[PDB]
RNA sequence: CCAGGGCUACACACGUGCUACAAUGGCGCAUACAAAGAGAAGCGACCUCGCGAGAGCAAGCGGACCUCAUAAAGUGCGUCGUAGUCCGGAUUGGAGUCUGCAACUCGACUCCAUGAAGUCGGAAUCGCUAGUAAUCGUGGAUCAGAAUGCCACGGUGAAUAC
């Protein structure tokens, strides 16, 4: 029970425990096992040793754990240094997707700062 | 974003301005009120000073500014902080 | 010591070419590989010092030597003589059998492994690198852990300058970049 | 070495996904399974393709044609 | 009169809401049950593609005829078995669709990757006496597009008043 450079849990089922990978959800893991040919409600423990081999050849084509953490950090830092409207909001901690910042901007700004 | 069967959007005048800029070959700052036009790859390497409601602020287009729009580099509000 | 016979037969004759040595004793070799856990949180309790030495003894199969404070400083809140770390000195037959698992088994298991630096040889051949995770070794069980440690590697060698030690380890196909 | 203080140490045999059945000496006690030997890991062909900085103009002219 | 900008700004303060903190629940699969409405530059069957919002070709109706239109909670079966979880959905990355001269400021929606706070809330305070409260859907007006708002409708359906 070790898929894609991380450890994936033992006693969770097939499609659920693959979602520990940074890069798959409930849908894309159904694409893994329907292509490979495994039923979806067995655990990742008591999968045979001819089953963990090919399962990463399904995983390797996706842009995953280290390959996906870098291009997001490359995307956001590319928005930083052009001078676009998006990157100004990425370097000032104020949200990007149009939302109201007069009130309810408590995620990008963090919880409430008292006046000092 | 605009649809892809429609294609990109640009003003007909700024397309004629940049073409007349490259064909003549100037580095004069083109001032244009088209924040809603998408930048074309002939606009790379030019100074195009797009308006922000108050004045004209220059933009020298590098490579990574192709699929963007001109208004993103002309900030239209102004803010230093409250205290 | 698998890789030591590989040193004797093929790595020596390689390095004799590219540096024009005029004696068989002049070619570089490695002396020792030292593994340090600086465990500063033992001043709170000895409980975390005891389980850090169970890690690094299982990794490299010798008993670890507990180090002590050389001088008593207040910026770190330690006296003179508090146990503040451990270490293992590996030499000879047991040295290459760490270095066999190192550049084959242990190092490519690092999460987001990109490769190692090469400006990191401090002038006189000695390479020192640090690892961020004791989990990477095939010894410690991933579930039996309790607290994450970290250590480093120090490959002391008999290279004269900064250049000969980079070329020494490159003939052990070291994973630089 | 001192015959009492040290942990056990013995030849084990390590198996990887690259088809390697490799022999070391290690303090595990049981046998070993691997995923990345240093003969298969993306270190000599992986860092090349994974960058993919990409042509900015070809982002623009793959979308459409004038 | 015109173009762009602003009415959408944010150390922060209060009022009204929606969604939550899970098993009286989440997901998957099969499957029963409404009322009230609008519709011509309008609503837009089926067929054909598309992971999907949609697109193509294009009938049907100025309407108890036709379409909008599939009610949902529920029930049958199956799983997950108390974890920040197969709970929660914010938030950001890359793709899109659409209406619209025109979606950077400053639209809704789709698909995929990311997966915050939150485990029932101090003092204080509000609504409600029966088809009420609670609950779960559904339509409409403003309107090119843009409802957690406003107005309207049925399904389930209590506790208690010395
Ligand atoms: Mg995941
Ligand atoms: Mg005006
Ligand atoms: Mg207003
Ligand atoms: Mg308040
Ligand atoms: Mg959910
Ligand atoms: Mg259930
Ligand atoms: Mg279809
Ligand atoms: Mg929390
Ligand atoms: Mg989702
Ligand atoms: Mg609980
Ligand atoms: Mg309407
Ligand atoms: Mg409307
Ligand atoms: Zn493998």
From Swiss-Prot, chain A:
<keyword id="KW-0694">RNA-binding</keyword>
<feature type="region of interest" description="Disordered">
    <location>
        <begin position="93"/>
        <end position="116"/>
    </location>
</feature>
<dbReference type="GO" id="GO:0015935">
    <property type="term" value="C:small ribosomal subunit"/>
</dbReference>
<protein>
    <recommendedName>
        <fullName>Small ribosomal subunit protein uS13</fullName>
    </recommendedName>
</protein>
<dbReference type="GO" id="GO:0003735">
    <property type="term" value="F:structural constituent of ribosome"/>
</dbReference>
<keyword id="KW-0820">tRNA-binding</keyword>
<keyword id="KW-0687">Ribonucleoprotein</keyword>
<comment type="function">
    <text>Located at the top of the head of the 30S subunit, it contacts several helices of the 16S rRNA.</text>
</comment>
<dbReference type="InterPro" id="IPR001892">
    <property type="entry name" value="Ribosomal_uS13"/>
</dbReference>
<keyword id="KW-0689">Ribosomal protein</keyword>
<dbReference type="InterPro" id="IPR019980">
    <property type="entry name" value="Ribosomal_uS13_bac-type"/>
</dbReference>
<dbReference type="GO" id="GO:0019843">
    <property type="term" value="F:rRNA binding"/>
</dbReference>
Swiss-Prot record, chain B:
<dbReference type="InterPro" id="IPR023575">
    <property type="entry name" value="Ribosomal_uS19_SF"/>
</dbReference>
<comment type="similarity">
    <text>Belongs to the universal ribosomal protein uS19 family.</text>
</comment>
<dbReference type="InterPro" id="IPR005732">
    <property type="entry name" value="Ribosomal_uS19_bac-type"/>
</dbReference>
<dbReference type="InterPro" id="IPR020934">
    <property type="entry name" value="Ribosomal_uS19_CS"/>
</dbReference>
<dbReference type="InterPro" id="IPR002222">
    <property type="entry name" value="Ribosomal_uS19"/>
</dbReference>
<dbReference type="GO" id="GO:0022627">
    <property type="term" value="C:cytosolic small ribosomal subunit"/>
</dbReference>
<dbReference type="GO" id="GO:0005829">
    <property type="term" value="C:cytosol"/>
</dbReference>
<protein>
    <recommendedName>
        <fullName>Small ribosomal subunit protein uS19</fullName>
    </recommendedName>
</protein>
<dbReference type="GO" id="GO:0019843">
    <property type="term" value="F:rRNA binding"/>
</dbReference>
<comment type="subunit">
    <text>Part of the 30S ribosomal subunit. Binds S13 and L5 and cross-links to the A site tRNA.</text>
</comment>
<dbReference type="GO" id="GO:0000028">
    <property type="term" value="P:ribosomal small subunit assembly"/>
</dbReference>
<keyword id="KW-0687">Ribonucleoprotein</keyword>
Curated annotation (Swiss-Prot), chain C:
<keyword id="KW-0687">Ribonucleoprotein</keyword>
<dbReference type="InterPro" id="IPR020929">
    <property type="entry name" value="Ribosomal_uL5_CS"/>
</dbReference>
<keyword id="KW-0820">tRNA-binding</keyword>
<keyword id="KW-0007">Acetylation</keyword>
<comment type="similarity">
    <text>Belongs to the universal ribosomal protein uL5 family.</text>
</comment>
<dbReference type="GO" id="GO:0006412">
    <property type="term" value="P:translation"/>
</dbReference>
<dbReference type="InterPro" id="IPR022803">
    <property type="entry name" value="Ribosomal_uL5_dom_sf"/>
</dbReference>
<keyword id="KW-0689">Ribosomal protein</keyword>
<dbReference type="GO" id="GO:0000049">
    <property type="term" value="F:tRNA binding"/>
</dbReference>
<dbReference type="GO" id="GO:0008097">
    <property type="term" value="F:5S rRNA binding"/>
</dbReference>
<comment type="function">
    <text>In the 70S ribosome in the initiation state was modeled to contact protein S13 of the 30S subunit (bridge B1b), connecting the 2 subunits; the protein-protein contacts between S13 and L5 in B1b change in the model with bound EF-G implicating this bridge in subunit movement. In the two 3.5 A resolved ribosome structures the contacts between L5, S13 and S19 are different, confirming the dynamic nature of this interaction.</text>
</comment>
<dbReference type="InterPro" id="IPR020930">
    <property type="entry name" value="Ribosomal_uL5_bac-type"/>
</dbReference>
From Swiss-Prot, chain D:
<dbReference type="InterPro" id="IPR034704">
    <property type="entry name" value="Ribosomal_bL28/bL31-like_sf"/>
</dbReference>
<dbReference type="GO" id="GO:0019843">
    <property type="term" value="F:rRNA binding"/>
</dbReference>
<keyword id="KW-0007">Acetylation</keyword>
<feature type="binding site">
    <location>
        <position position="16"/>
    </location>
    <ligand>
        <name>Zn(2+)</name>
    </ligand>
</feature>
<comment type="similarity">
    <text>Belongs to the bacterial ribosomal protein bL31 family. Type A subfamily.</text>
</comment>
<dbReference type="GO" id="GO:0002181">
    <property type="term" value="P:cytoplasmic translation"/>
</dbReference>
<protein>
    <recommendedName>
        <fullName>Large ribosomal subunit protein bL31</fullName>
    </recommendedName>
</protein>
<keyword id="KW-0862">Zinc</keyword>
<dbReference type="GO" id="GO:0006413">
    <property type="term" value="P:translational initiation"/>
</dbReference>
<dbReference type="GO" id="GO:0005829">
    <property type="term" value="C:cytosol"/>
</dbReference>
<keyword id="KW-0687">Ribonucleoprotein</keyword>
<dbReference type="GO" id="GO:1904689">
    <property type="term" value="P:negative regulation of cytoplasmic translational initiation"/>
</dbReference>
């Amino acid at each position: 029970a070790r898929i894609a450079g991380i450890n994936i849990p033992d006693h969770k089922h097939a499609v659920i425990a693959l979602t520990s990978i940074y890069g798959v959800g409930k849908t894309r893991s159904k694409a893994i096992l329907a292509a490979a040919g495994i039923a979806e409600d067995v655990k990742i423990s008591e999968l045979s040793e001819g089953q963990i081999d090919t399962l990463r050849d399904e995983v390797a084509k996706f842009v995953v754990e280290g390959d996906l953490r870098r291009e997001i950090s490359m995307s956001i830092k590319r928005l930083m240094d052009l001078g676009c409207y998006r990157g100004l909001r990425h370097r000032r901690g104020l949200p990007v997707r149009g939302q109201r910042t007069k009130t309810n901007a408590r995620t990008r700004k963090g919880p409430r700062k008292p006046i000092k | 974003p605009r649809s892809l069967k429609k294609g990109p959007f640009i003003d007909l005048h700024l397309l004629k301005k940049v073409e007349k800029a490259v064909e003549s070959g100037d580095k004069k700052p083109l001032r244009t009120w088209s924040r809603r036009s998408t930048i074309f790859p002939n606009m790379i390497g030019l100074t195009i000073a797009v308006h922000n409601g108050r004045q004209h602020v220059p933009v020298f287009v590098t490579d990574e500014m192709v699929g963007h729009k001109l208004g993103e580099f002309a900030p239209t509000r102004t803010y230093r902080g409250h205290a | 010591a698998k890789l030591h016979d590989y040193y004797k037969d093929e790595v020596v004759k390689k390095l004799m070419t590219e540096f024009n040595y005029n004696s068989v004793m002049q070619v570089p070799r490695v002396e020792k590989i030292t593994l340090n856990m600086g465990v500063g949180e033992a001043i709170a309790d000895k409980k975390l010092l005891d389980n850090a030495a169970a890690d690094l003894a299982a990794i490299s199969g010798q008993k670890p030597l507990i180090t002590k404070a050389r001088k008593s400083v207040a910026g770190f809140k330690i006296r003179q003589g508090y146990p503040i770390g451990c270490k293992v000195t590996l030499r000879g037959e047991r040295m290459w059998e760490f270095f066999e698992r190192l550049i084959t088994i242990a190092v490519p298991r690092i999460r987001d492994f990109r490769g190692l630096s090469a400006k990191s040889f401090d002038g006189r051949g000695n390479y020192s690198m640090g690892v961020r995770e004791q989990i990477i070794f095939p010894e410690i069980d991933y579930d039996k852990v309790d607290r994450v440690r970290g250590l480093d590697i120090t490959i002391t060698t008999t290279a004269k300058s900064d250049e000969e030690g980079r070329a020494l380890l490159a003939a052990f196909d070291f994973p630089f970049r | 070495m001192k015959k009492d203080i040290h942990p056990k140490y013995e030849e084990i045999t390590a198996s990887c996904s690259c088809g390697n059945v490799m022999k070391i000496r290690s303090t595990v006690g049981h046998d070993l399974n691997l995923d990345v030997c240093s003969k298969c890991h993306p270190f000599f062909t992986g860092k090349q393709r994974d960058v993919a900085t990409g042509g900015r103009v070809d982002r623009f002219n793959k979308r459409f044609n004038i």
